[PDB]
Amino acid sequence: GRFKPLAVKKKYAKKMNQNKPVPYWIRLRTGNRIKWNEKRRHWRRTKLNY
Amino acid sequence: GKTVLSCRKGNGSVYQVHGHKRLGSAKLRILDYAERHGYMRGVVKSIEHEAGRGAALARVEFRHPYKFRRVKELMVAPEGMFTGQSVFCGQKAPLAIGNVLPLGQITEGCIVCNVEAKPGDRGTLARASGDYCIIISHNHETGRTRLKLPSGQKKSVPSTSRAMIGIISGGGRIEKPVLKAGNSFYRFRGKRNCWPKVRGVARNPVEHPHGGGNHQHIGHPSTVSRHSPPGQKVGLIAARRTGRIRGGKAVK
Amino acid sequence: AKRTVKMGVMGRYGTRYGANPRKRAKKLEVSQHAKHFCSFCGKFAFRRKAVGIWRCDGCSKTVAGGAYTLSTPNNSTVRSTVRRLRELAKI
RNA sequence: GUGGUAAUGCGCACUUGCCAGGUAACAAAUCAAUCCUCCCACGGUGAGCUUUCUUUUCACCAUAAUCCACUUGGGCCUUUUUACGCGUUGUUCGGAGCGGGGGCUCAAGAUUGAAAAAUGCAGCUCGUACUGUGUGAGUUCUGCGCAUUAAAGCAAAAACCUGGGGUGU
RNA sequence: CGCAUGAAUGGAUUAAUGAGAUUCCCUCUGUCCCGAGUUACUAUCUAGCGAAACGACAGUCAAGGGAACGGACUUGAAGGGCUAAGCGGGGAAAGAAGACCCUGUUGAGUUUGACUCCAGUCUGGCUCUGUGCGGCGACGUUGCUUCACUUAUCGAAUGAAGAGACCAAUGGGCGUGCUGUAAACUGAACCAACGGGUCCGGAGUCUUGUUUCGAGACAUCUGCCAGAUGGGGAGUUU
RNA sequence: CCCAACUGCAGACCGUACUCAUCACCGCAUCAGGUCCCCAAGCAUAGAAUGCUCUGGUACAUAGAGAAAGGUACACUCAGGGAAGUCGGCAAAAUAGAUGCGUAAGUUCGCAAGAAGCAUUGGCUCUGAGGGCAAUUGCCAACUCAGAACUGCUUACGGCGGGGAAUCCAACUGUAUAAUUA
RNA sequence: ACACGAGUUGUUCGGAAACUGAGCACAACGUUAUAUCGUUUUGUUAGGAAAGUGAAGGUACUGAAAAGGGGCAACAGAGAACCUGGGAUUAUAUUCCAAAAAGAAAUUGCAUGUGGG
RNA sequence: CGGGGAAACCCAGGUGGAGGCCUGUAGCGAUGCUGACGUGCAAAUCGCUCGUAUGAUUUGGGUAUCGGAGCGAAAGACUCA
């Protein structure tokens, strides 16, 4: 819909930023574990209800 | 088992008065100094209809006895009360239809409506369409006035009580058959959630003491004691009589 | 012509609610849709509005008269007795 | 403040000190019906069809808000008096003032201008200049409410408005 | 002569109405005699994709006995292997720790004349709880009690808006607060004019004091104690 | 200090994408289910029924070859008989639009009733009737109904009631066991 | 799908500032061993002293008048001052366009100037 | 509007548009096939047929009443499969 509180708009603003993939260099840190981002998301599944 | 439906109406959840479309309470004018020592004179500004009342109300506009302003009272119109009429209310007020006199001032056998059972009550009784009291006798020592009412019982009101002369507006209503479930619909719509009403023998035994089975039937006498607890009192509550009244109908 | 023998205003309930209850409503049904004499102007102008509210078309007066008619039969006594019962006290 | 016999017209002030009333505010059906849509008529530009036929078939032909200066329907005044007459598709109305003459006002429009052709659209010319610009069927905005069957009678308040009284005096 | 019909536990009728129950008739028909042909989409074969139910091991029969109805054992008869589409006789086929029935010192929903109690409603006593003249009793006191009171308390109304008095005792140290109305039929009223010497009037003053009205020591008041009722509700058994 | 017509400067806050569904939501999913509101063309027709079409939008739903049996169908037909089938006319067939005539018992006088039943219908060329406006006369629009002559039927889209004689029950409209009982 | 950049523009559009409705429950009061309970719109809280406003007058005192505390609940009710044109876009628009604003208006606040009082 | 009658009233033609009225869309339902499906399109769907369709109608948002309790035109219905 068009309506939204602004407080709710930001929560989706944050969650849009967090969907980016794991940087390529950060795999190369010495003693590194993280490979691909495990918290990624797609609106088609697991819907935020904010 | 489950609670009986006559008990669930006691919560007042869904079963409260609707009363949105209503105009407010209908009372006689306040009892004032002028009301007691004199009369205040208003004028009937309109005659209209509460949703869910069978009578016809009246907006009567007095003038304020103290400040400069004009107060509007809403009372239950007598029979021939017409728009533009001047209504007198007080002790000096002459005896005429629609005027409000203190009930000790009214003759002997007059027809009276909208009585107040307590001197300052602004009227509680004989307020239903077509109903009127008949004042019987004034007792000049004790200061009481005996009168019959609509149910035939005869009561004694303190004679400083006020009264309105003449029968109440509506009349009838009852004398006309409804003919359909449909006219019974908006009937109570302006009143309550009273309707339609499932009779007890149809409903299951948890919900009602009549809730029996193979053959719709009560199975135990339907007359119930006065001391029966809530959820039990059902049917005829402490009936002195039962069945057809063949002659008699003594006032109940 | 005359398009019903008896039923009259009740022909709108076609076969339906039974002879005697229809016939009993018909009285009170034609009463309220009748035009009643207005003792103020003199026309027969009153129409029933709501229950008991009777408005004159010539006068624009409204009256509390009630039910399906202007004056219920025991109103006439109540109005005549007090005309008597006021008059008797004045002397 | 001030004109008209009058319905009411015209543009020194302040009034939420107080009061009174309005707007906001609600409603069937029938009939008529606004913007607008469709169809027909007129004929201008391009296109389609062409063995034969078709003065032809298809598309387009537009004017926003805002602000200025005859018709239809209602309420009303003055005049002449009416008891049969006026009027609707329709269940009406009048000495508590019908009908007629002449007027006042309100509602919905029509019209002529400002805006506004400088725009839009189409065609065409050697990325420019030119050319073109209805007594029909629907339609709920409206007439329209003290307004529907009704033992159904159809929310309220802010905010605004005018008056009473007063201030100016 | 109704096993066992019957009167608002409603009896008897009943036009109109019904996706209600039933029976005949006309019409019509592949419902049928008795089946036949045609169509789309399947099944069928292919390309791509590609599961589940189920699964001890397995799988041809006759007879015998057996847990008394065998794929296996006994004695016979069949049996070359591998396959595609069907089919529904068997696998006492698949689903689901039989819902029927019984059992268990397992329940649960309801009912009542079960056993056992609980709220609710009523009832008694004390209490709340005061004052005065009295009447009946009991042994000056006390139980009860008629009546007249008003401050506890209770019921109501009001924007707590005008009580009572002045009219004076069983007190204390003419009338009764009074412009207006007498069937009714829609007008208005404010923010003092004015008089008297900035005050006092206009607009009476006073207070053993309640806001006013009704009831009133009563009960529908309050609390505890006591009994009756009590499937409305609880526990458990049967 | 107020009023009047202009002028001067300023006019802050949040949403604003996209979707609203045979794929954007809920139903474990891009699920033949469900989900409020607004705009709504042409012809046939009584029409928002139903059939086809210009603007807009689509060719996405796994496909190809293809005559087995057996099936499913928002698919048909059948000689003679016509309910003998079957628990039972289940399913199918049948009836059918509009106009005119006609219509029983029973009845609460309202109905029953579209009772039942009979007949007409196209195409073409004509004729009559039904009005408006302007000053008897002149000019004009938009449709409907009736009648006639000639000529044709292979009875030919879609859509659209089978009907009658009685018994039982409930008076009627309504509600009602979402997912076996309406 | 995935990856990498970009995209949502308002004095007037919707809300809020500022309406009331079915209703809700903060204060207050009362209950409860305990508030995490009840009352709280029939004109309106509370045994209840909840007004911070100021008519007239005297020069920031004097006191008429006003009874009934605070707030929320409507993106379909009430209320609301703006319209089209475009070559203004890959994607937003009654939102953007700048001197010939493509332009034409409406309205709120304050302020100066001229005209009047 | 006309006709009949001494009267009371009675007949006929139009207008009008009443009804929990009838046919029929959407809408709301859910009768029959005991049709499809029945490891589905679907943990109740689909096809034709059928009920009602100006009313006790259908529907959005808000708001109120729930666990021995709520709500119920009463079926042990419903209270997030």
Distance CA B156, CA B133 (A): 12
Q: Are strands C62-63 and B86-90 parallel, antiparallel or unpaired?
A: unpaired
CA B3-B4-B6 angle, to 5 degrees, is 130
**Whose structure tokens read 């007795």?**
C81
Residue B76 corresponds to which tokens in the numbers above?
């239950």
* Segment (H or E) for C22: helix C19-32
Resolution number, Å: 2.9
Bridge partner list, B39: B90
Bridge partner list, B145: B138, B157
Residues of B within 8 A of C52 (CB-CB) are 49, 54-56, 77, 129, 169-171
Residue B96 CA, chain-centre distance (Å), reads 23
CB-based burial, C21-36: b 16+ in 10 Å, e otherwise: ebeebeebbebbeeeb
Q: Do B56 and C17 touch (CB under 8 A)?
A: no
Distance CA C35, CA C59 (A): 13
Cα dihedral value B35, B39, B40, B44, nearest 10? 110
- Residue B189 buriedness (CB in 10 A; 0-12 / 13-18 / 19+): middle
Q: Across C19-86, where does the E strand assignment appear?
A: 36-37, 44-49, 53-55, 62-63
Q: Does C39 touch chain B (CB under 8 A)?
A: no
Nearest to B42 by CA among B25, B26, B23, B29: B29
Task: Sheet containing B133-139: give its strands across.
Answer: B72-76, B57-61, B39-48, B86-90, B100-102, B162-165, B111-113, B133-139, B144-147, B155-158
Three-class DSSP category at A11: helix
Choose among C13, C75, C88: nearest Cβ to B80.
C75
Q: Is B155 left (phi over 0), alpha (psi -120 to 50) or beta?
A: beta
8 A C-beta contact, residue B203 and residue B211? yes
8 A C-beta contact, residue C32 and residue C54? no
A15 C-beta less than 7 Å away from strand F: no
Residue B79 corresponds to which tokens in the numbers above?
């029979």
Distance CA C9, CA C24 (A): 12
Q: For residue B194, what is the DSSP state?
A: -
- The amino acid at B236: L
* Segment (H or E) for B139: strand B133-139
How was this model experimentally determined? Answer: cryo-EM
Residue A5 corresponds to which tokens in the numbers above?
């509180």
C27 C-beta less than 7 Å away from strand F: no
B16 C-beta less than 7 Å away from strand H: no
Residues of B within 8 A of C61 (CB-CB) are 82-84
Distance CA C33, CA C37 (A): 13
8 A C-beta contact, residue B169 and residue B78? yes
Separation of B50 CA and H62 C1' (Å): 26
Separation in Å, CA A48 to CA A1, A11, A13, A41, C74: 15, 10, 12, 10, 74
Distance CA B203, CA A41 (A): 54
A42 C-beta less than 7 Å away from strand F: no
**Whose structure tokens read 């109940």?**
B252
Helices (H), B29-123: 33-37
Distance CA B216, CA B88 (A): 59
Inter-chain Cβ pairs, chain B and chain C, closer than 8 A: 132
Choose among C61, C69, C78: nearest Cβ to B167.
C78
